[PDB]
Amino acid sequence: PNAPACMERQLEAARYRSDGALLLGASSLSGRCWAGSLWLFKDPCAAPNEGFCSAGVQTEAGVADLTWVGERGILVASDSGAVELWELDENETLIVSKFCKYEHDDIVSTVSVLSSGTQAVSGSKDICIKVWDLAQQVVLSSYRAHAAQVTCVAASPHKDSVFLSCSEDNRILLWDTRCPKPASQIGGYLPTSLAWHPQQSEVFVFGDENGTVSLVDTKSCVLSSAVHSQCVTGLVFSPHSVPFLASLSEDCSLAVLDSSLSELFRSQAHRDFVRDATWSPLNHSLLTTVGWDHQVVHHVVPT
Amino acid sequence: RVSSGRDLNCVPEIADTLGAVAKQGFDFLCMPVFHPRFKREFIQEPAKNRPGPQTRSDLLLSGRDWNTLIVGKLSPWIRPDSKVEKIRRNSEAAMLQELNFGAYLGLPAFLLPLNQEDNTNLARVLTNHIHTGHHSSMFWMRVPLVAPEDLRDDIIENAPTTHTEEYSGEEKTWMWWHNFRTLCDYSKRIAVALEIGADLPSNHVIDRWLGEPIKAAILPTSIFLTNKKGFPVLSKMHQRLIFRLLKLEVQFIITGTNHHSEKEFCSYLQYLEYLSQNRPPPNAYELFAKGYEDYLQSPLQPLMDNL
Amino acid sequence: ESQTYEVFEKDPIKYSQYQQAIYKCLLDRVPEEEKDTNVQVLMVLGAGRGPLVNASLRAAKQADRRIKLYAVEKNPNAVVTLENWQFEEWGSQVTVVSSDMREWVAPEKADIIVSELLGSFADNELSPECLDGAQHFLKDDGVSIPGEYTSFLAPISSSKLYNEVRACREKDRDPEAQFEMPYVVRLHNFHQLSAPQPCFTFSHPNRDPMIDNNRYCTLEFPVEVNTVLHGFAGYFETVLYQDITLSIRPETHSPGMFSWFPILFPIKQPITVREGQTICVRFWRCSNSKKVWYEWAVTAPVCSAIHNPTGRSYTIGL
Amino acid sequence: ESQTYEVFEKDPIKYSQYQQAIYKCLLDRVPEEEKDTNVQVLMVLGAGRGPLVNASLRAAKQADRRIKLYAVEKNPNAVVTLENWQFEEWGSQVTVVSSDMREWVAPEKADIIVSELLGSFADNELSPECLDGAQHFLKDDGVSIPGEYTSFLAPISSSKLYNEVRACREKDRDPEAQFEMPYVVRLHNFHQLSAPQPCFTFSHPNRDPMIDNNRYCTLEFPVEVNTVLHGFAGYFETVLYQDITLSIRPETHSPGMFSWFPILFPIKQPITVREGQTICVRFWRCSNSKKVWYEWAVTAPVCSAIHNPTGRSYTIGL
Numbered sequence A: 001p002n003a004p005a006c007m008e009r010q011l012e013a014a015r016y017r018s019d020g021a022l023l024l025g026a027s028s029l030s031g032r033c034w035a036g037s038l039w040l041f042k043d044p045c046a047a048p049n050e051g052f053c054s055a056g057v058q059t060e061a062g063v064a065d066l067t068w069v070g071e072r073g074i075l076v077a078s079d080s081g082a083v084e085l086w087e088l089d090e091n092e093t094l095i096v097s098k099f100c101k102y103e104h105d106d107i108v109s110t111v112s113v114l115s116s117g118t119q120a121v122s123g124s125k126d127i128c129i130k131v132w133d134l135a136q137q138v139v140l141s142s143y144r145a146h147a148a149q150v151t152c153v154a155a156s157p158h159k160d161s162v163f164l165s166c167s168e169d170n171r172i173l174l175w176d177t178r179c180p181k182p183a184s185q186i187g188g189y190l191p192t193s194l195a196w197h198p199q200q201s202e203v204f205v206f207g208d209e210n211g212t213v214s215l216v217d218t219k220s221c222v223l224s225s226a227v228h229s230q231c232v233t234g235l236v237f238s239p240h241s242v243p244f245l246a247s248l249s250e251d252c253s254l255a256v257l258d259s260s261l262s263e264l265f266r267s268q269a270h271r272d273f274v275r276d277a278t279w280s281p282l283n284h285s286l287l288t289t290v291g292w293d294h295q296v297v298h299h300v301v302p303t
Numbered sequence B: 001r002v003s004s005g006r007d008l009n010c011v012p013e014i015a016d017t018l019g020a021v022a023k024q025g026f027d028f029l030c031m032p033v034f035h036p037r038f039k040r041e042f043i044q045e046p047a048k049n050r051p052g053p054q055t056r057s058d059l060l061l062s063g064r065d066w067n068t069l070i071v072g073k074l075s076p077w078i079r080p081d082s083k084v085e086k087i088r089r090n091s092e093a094a095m096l097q098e099l100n101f102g103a104y105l106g107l108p109a110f111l112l113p114l115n116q117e118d119n120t121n122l123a124r125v126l127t128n129h130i131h132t133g134h135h136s137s138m139f140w141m142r143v144p145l146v147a148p149e150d151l152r153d154d155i156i157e158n159a160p161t162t163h164t165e166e167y168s169g170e171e172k173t174w175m176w177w178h179n180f181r182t183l184c185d186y187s188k189r190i191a192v193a194l195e196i197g198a199d200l201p202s203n204h205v206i207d208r209w210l211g212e213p214i215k216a217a218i219l220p221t222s223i224f225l226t227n228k229k230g231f232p233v234l235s236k237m238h239q240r241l242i243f244r245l246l247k248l249e250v251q252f253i254i255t256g257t258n259h260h261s262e263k264e265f266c267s268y269l270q271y272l273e274y275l276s277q278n279r280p281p282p283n284a285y286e287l288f289a290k291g292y293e294d295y296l297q298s299p300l301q302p303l304m305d306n307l
Numbered sequence C, D: 001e002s003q004t005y006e007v008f009e010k011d012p013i014k015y016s017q018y019q020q021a022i023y024k025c026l027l028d029r030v031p032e033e034e035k036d037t038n039v040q041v042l043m044v045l046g047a048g049r050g051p052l053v054n055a056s057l058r059a060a061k062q063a064d065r066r067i068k069l070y071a072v073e074k075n076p077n078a079v080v081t082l083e084n085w086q087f088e089e090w091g092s093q094v095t096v097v098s099s100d101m102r103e104w105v106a107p108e109k110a111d112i113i114v115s116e117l118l119g120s121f122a123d124n125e126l127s128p129e130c131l132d133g134a135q136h137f138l139k140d141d142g143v144s145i146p147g148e149y150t151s152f153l154a155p156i157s158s159s160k161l162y163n164e165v166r167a168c169r170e171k172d173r174d175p176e177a178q179f180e181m182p183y184v185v186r187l188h189n190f191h192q193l194s195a196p197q198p199c200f201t202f203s204h205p206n207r208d209p210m211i212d213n214n215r216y217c218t219l220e221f222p223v224e225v226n227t228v229l230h231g232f233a234g235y236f237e238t239v240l241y242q243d244i245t246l247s248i249r250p251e252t253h254s255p256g257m258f259s260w261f262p263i264l265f266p267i268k269q270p271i272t273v274r275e276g277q278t279i280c281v282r283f284w285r286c287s288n289s290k291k292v293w294y295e296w297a298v299t300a301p302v303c304s305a306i307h308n309p310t311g312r313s314y315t316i317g318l
């Protein structure tokens, strides 16, 4: 279908857009060639079959992390040290490379798009955090705030200048580029995943390496729960008015939590690491997970 | 003139990567044996029973290529001294696996990081590997001249950088090394890969590394200034350091992306060559002595013996 | 040897504790109304010349409960003692088994398993490995005696003991092998710098999935004097059942008992320690399919070499 | 290591013999009328980087018969090679297994088992023990390739080689350990006194109840010259299937093959031998649950010391 013959085993990311087309990233973390790819599925249930895809493209290197830049654009965190931007064509069959800027000196692990939509922030193993302009295609700022590999960065949903970051230096930094010293350290186990609350601009949750999912207010006193037995890879809130939190981990499970971090759902569907989760915008009770076992499971969350 | 290598943490095709590196004038290539992000489980099901090949085939290169042109790298996720018991046990099994595969390939060297104070369990595992089968592979300990915490940007509002002169504290990375190599009991297989930072420390911090087994000197692309022509150069501070390092006859490794995008990547190496040629030439002493560096010999006894 | 078992048997305090431990467990497991209905299946794992078997008989009599004894023993020389006793005294209540407990295919599951596989550093006789292998023929609600044991360590200064170890250099091995192996010794002319702290712990029956007996423990010992560290004294405590215990830890030492002297883990080079400083020691328990061994290293106030890497100087045979 | 497997693979004569051996067995086991009905289950035990797997594919193609391959390999580093090959080339016909053959629980029984577990003295890689353990998942009418192998010994005079062994004395072990261990060596500057004679033989599958791989063989070598005995050259023959064989015995040496140099069993002290006298050597194959080793002693014309008692100087790891 005007795309690569075969996609890679390890599925790294899965995102839904407005209408309900499932974006897929994937890397080969084994075998002769260690490269990545991007895929589109107007039919979510057809995944991850390569013969029934709307769009698909092979990238130079692996895909560590991606996210939607609205409807057309796809921003990639590459192992090469490049942050790549791809854009769907007007037919939405091809995927042409917009930019591909080698600025990080090591693997780009995490990326997130800021409120404006013309800016993004990336985090790499070279310990830096960089602020991009997607229009001019240049780095606005470069920040060595952490003292170890940057794990996860997460843009504030309604504030352009604000974003979170976390690193193996055991720091969770809350940023605000308006301040001269932008970073602000929020006061045991290393933070691995971040997620802003969708309806509250001052609330966020973080998952750690030990498996604990926490609930933090920016003002004050925190709440937490031991959800997973191993590292929390990602956290994604549902599109509900009263949101449910979906937590994934390396213990090969999925858990859907309420507002007080009480377990509602449990899914031991995957056989390998669970890498991403994305709620269906059409049906808010559906949740799609992807993993290194090369499954694309669709969960019916009891809501 | 100068022996140089290339550090990469991203190799999509091992055959293609070498060709590019070799064309630029590098002698060897530092690269991973397992994909940096390919995290593996060894205890808990079902991830421990993950199918398929764990990495690339040894057949992709020739035996000679592995033996002379490739330096191994421990994966970044491997943390043997983690506070979490699970991660510790997993990193142990992973470290042994990667080290074993290194020996299987017959790699001349393998890089392990010293990026924190406590590397005790790291040392305990490496020592165990050293006392296993048959291999003569060197282990280069990646250790920074200045710790990452001490060269971070002062941009955290409620955590400012230490603006105090701490004489002992600025020598901390040497203590990292010293403790490690003491635990390993001065193994001749364990040497230093000294990573040079943007801001060099005080002179005493550098003098600390005199008389240490420095085999490599890692040079990030970020530390290079740009001249009027628009090509990479170094400061007078770094120039004196490289001049000192050229006397020790170390192997210079280049790491990081091309910040001088307009030029080639050979330019970095060409500058080291430029420095190599531009040094004070060996005198009658150093010309004749060249060969007998740190070579132990018995004191002659012309009375007892007949010369 | 025979006389090695003899001196074990000459410690009545130890066995009276075993007797009491079994006595209590029998009462807990069997109520008064099921006195003559329920016969408990006991299995002495490592019977030797049969002190624990005798104690199991005494315990059942003072409790007034019915028991069915197995006497598993691998040592065939001891099994000669057991069978001669069994024929003359015990009878068909005791079934002498001449086998390894890890191998033995049990014809019945046990309600209680009794064992005496503890050395001076608790787990130095591989009690974990043996009881793990014998775990399958325990009932789902079965008990082990002992149910738990812990090892303790304490830094010591002894220029005597250091010099004693030094003198254990032998031909045709590493010059410093003697420093990389523990010794059983009645510590006399020595100074204990800090109070003992717990090193390794083992529970039986082990219910942690994929049972791993490998360990790594960091201890920090606050020293309040100037001194010179020469090694680490090792002790142990064990919980036989509940409040019945044995111990050679000085502060909680079982009175009268003399069936265990302390163990000593030397170091190659003495280490100066100033008043106020902390001695930091690291202890590993390591294994493969053939051997189990310890490694250790001092990390404060100065670093030592890691001792006994890969069990080069000392292993315990599986 | 990789390059150790590389040099093995660079002996085409050896594998062509394996190819031919399997080719013949396939034709014998599967008739012409059952060509596309019967799929034979082959199991390469010790696959390495997969030369025997490739040969098994070639053999099946030249025979024109259907096969289902397993590729058992314990070395995890080699298993990387196998799986990359398997994904790219072989496919789902070959099932790569990453396990010990003694441990592996087979999901199917084999019609043929292929192995390459032979050293220079045949059984010095413990091919008996491995194939004995893998014997249970062979069909009752199953075949092993090789089906048999024998080791040969011959007394040699070499003042060079004696002096070479002598020089292998190392610190921190027995002064004469070097004499109590075999060496792989291309014997050049030496004199063979008597003609080689068979020492130890092994058949697979072994059908002798309570299979014992321990042995004791007495050989008498008629010497027809004055000389000085310095050791014993060791060779081997193997029957892959029927008339297809491999050999490094000088008189029946496979032409071209260079995947095995002879082995040498030294002696501590040289032994005078007059013309007409007989050299009498004794060879043991010994074992316990952990190790296998050889011992040996000359008993004529004079006695030597028994070499390598209890495998003190040399063991082979199980």
Ligand SMILES: Nc1ccc2[nH]c(CN3C(=O)c4cc(F)ccc4[C@]34CCN(Cc3ccc(F)cc3)C4=O)cc2n1
Pocket (backbone or CB within 6 Å): C007, C008, C116, C117, C118, C119, C120, C125, C184, C258, C259, C260, C261, C262
């Ligand atoms: N399963 C068992 C059951 C009883 C057990 N006792 C032990 C302790 N142990 C040794 O390891 C050891 C090693 C030796 F070369 C010599 C002696 C011992 C002892 C056993 C006796 N004894 C005290 C003593 C010694 C000498 C005295 F004049 C008085 C009193 C120890 O210290 C392990 C163990 N293991």
Ligand SMILES: Nc1ccc2[nH]c(CN3C(=O)c4cc(F)ccc4[C@]34CCN(Cc3ccc(F)cc3)C4=O)cc2n1
Pocket (backbone or CB within 6 Å): D007, D008, D116, D117, D118, D119, D120, D125, D184, D258, D259, D260, D261, D262
């Ligand atoms: N499973 C297998 C499969 C093949 C196998 N070949 C062997 C023999 N072997 C050793 O034991 C050995 C031990 C060593 F330190 C070094 C080499 C060997 C050899 C393998 C190669 N080679 C011939 C040679 C050597 C050097 C040459 F320049 C040319 C030709 C031997 O003599 C066991 C075995 N076991």
Ligand SMILES: CSC[C@H]1O[C@@H](n2cnc3c(N)ncnc32)[C@H](O)[C@@H]1O
Pocket (backbone or CB within 6 Å): C045, C046, C047, C048, C049, C072, C073, C074, C075, C078, C099, C100, C101, C102, C116, C117, C130
């Ligand atoms: C009473 S001292 C401990 C006793 O346990 C025995 N023993 C140790 N290990 C085992 C084992 N695995 N199976 C059976 N008996 C054992 C020893 O032979 C000794 O007599």
Ligand SMILES: CSC[C@H]1O[C@@H](n2cnc3c(N)ncnc32)[C@H](O)[C@@H]1O
Pocket (backbone or CB within 6 Å): D045, D046, D047, D048, D049, D072, D073, D074, D075, D078, D099, D100, D101, D102, D116, D117, D130
């Ligand atoms: C082709 S050289 C012999 C091969 O057999 C393998 N091997 C030896 N013993 C065993 C065993 N018990 N189980 C599986 N593979 C084995 C070795 O790892 C080697 O690759």
